[PDB]
């Protein structure tokens, strides 16, 4: 997995393949129910959702 800072992987003498985390986060909608705490399930999962 990737943290928020990202991972730099390194393989042999070759280049350190850094990765920066893509914030893709697309499993939500707006709809007739809420689906915006679904956005907050994507962005910051499991925290800032206990607050509501």
């Amino acid at each position: 997995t990737v943290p928020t800072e990202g991972l730099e992987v390194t393989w042999g003498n070759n280049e350190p393949y850094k990765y920066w985390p893509q914030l893709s986060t697309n499993g939500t909608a707006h709809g007739h129910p809420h689906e915006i705490i679904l956005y907050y399930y994507e962005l910051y999962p499991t925290m800032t959702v206990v607050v509501v």
Partner: protein
Amino acid sequence: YEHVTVIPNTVGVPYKTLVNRPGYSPMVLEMELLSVTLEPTLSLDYITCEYKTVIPSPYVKCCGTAECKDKSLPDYSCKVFTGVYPFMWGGAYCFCDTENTQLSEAHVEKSESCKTEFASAYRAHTASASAKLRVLYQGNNVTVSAYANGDHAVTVKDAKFIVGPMSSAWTPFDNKIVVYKGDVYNMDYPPFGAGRPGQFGDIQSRTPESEDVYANTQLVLQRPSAGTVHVPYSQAPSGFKYWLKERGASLQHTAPFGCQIATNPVRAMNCAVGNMPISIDIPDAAFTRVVDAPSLTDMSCEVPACTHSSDFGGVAIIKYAASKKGKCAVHSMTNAVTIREAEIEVEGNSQLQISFSTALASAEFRVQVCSTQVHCAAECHPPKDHIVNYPASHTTLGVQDISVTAMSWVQKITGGVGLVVAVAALILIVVLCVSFSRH
């Protein structure tokens, strides 16, 4: 401006700073960090390299008992073995029969392989911070390596900058650190004179050219068995072979923040931590009045399409009817969206395309296009691609971002909530008036 800002300590992020000089032409400038060089205290303590178990030539006292010659040698050891037998080409090396004794001695010294290859027990603390920086000012990509501590002022084409100091003074180095030809390790090497035998670091001299070696190698000279002429001993634990077996977790690869090491002298390279203040100076020579700047009328920014992401996360067309011709700036005022190209040209009744990036879903945008403040609204998109190499710090937001409709759902649900305390106040005033009117 004497514009002193604090840019985040990120190598390769174009910081777009705003110069709205008072009643002057607006001017957006680019900066880009290129190196973060941190160099700690160069305090070499002592050395450790290979030794040499020095065995001198044995001393066979033929028909006689040799006695111990005390020689002040490191790990000196001597013993005269009694009842030996020597032999050579033509039988016995001695005419003597059974009173053949044989003196035998050995010791330890430094090795000559410490000519260039050795290990440096070494001390280090607070680094001398220096950094590389390229400023794009009006098509001028000037660059400068300055001391990142707030002491080294530098002017280039009259543009004045005092850089630094460093905000987070975090250090990846211990005091007692040992140095190999490309590496450094945080490890308590044993102190001088008080070193442990057989451990990596028993061999201890002060400078690499110093030969005064304290070492404990434990040469217990064995007896050569029967008639064979050699000098067996208790075996010598060579620390310097398995010094290199415990390279392992290299400080190049164990540093946080993506820090890089490069020894001799020891560079803590590119710490992605904190931020950095910087003074920004230029005179009014590139600054005409706001009316002498081309004043934009008919201003309208509109986002046709945006997928808010680490790429070019959006684009917007601005239609305008400016006053006149001029290379004038463009500054996004809302901090998430940042303008990709700091200054544009304007002529009058025209329109042009800007590109930018953010992460707000319902993106609000406000811009200083060199005369005027123009608002844009948007509904951008979260990305669907997966691999992005490079960061995007400008897209990032805090813990509070707007919804698309759920602000209204909040003040629908956190809307009428004091109606219950309103009728509770009704309860309180009716109980007060009946309790007081009756008593």
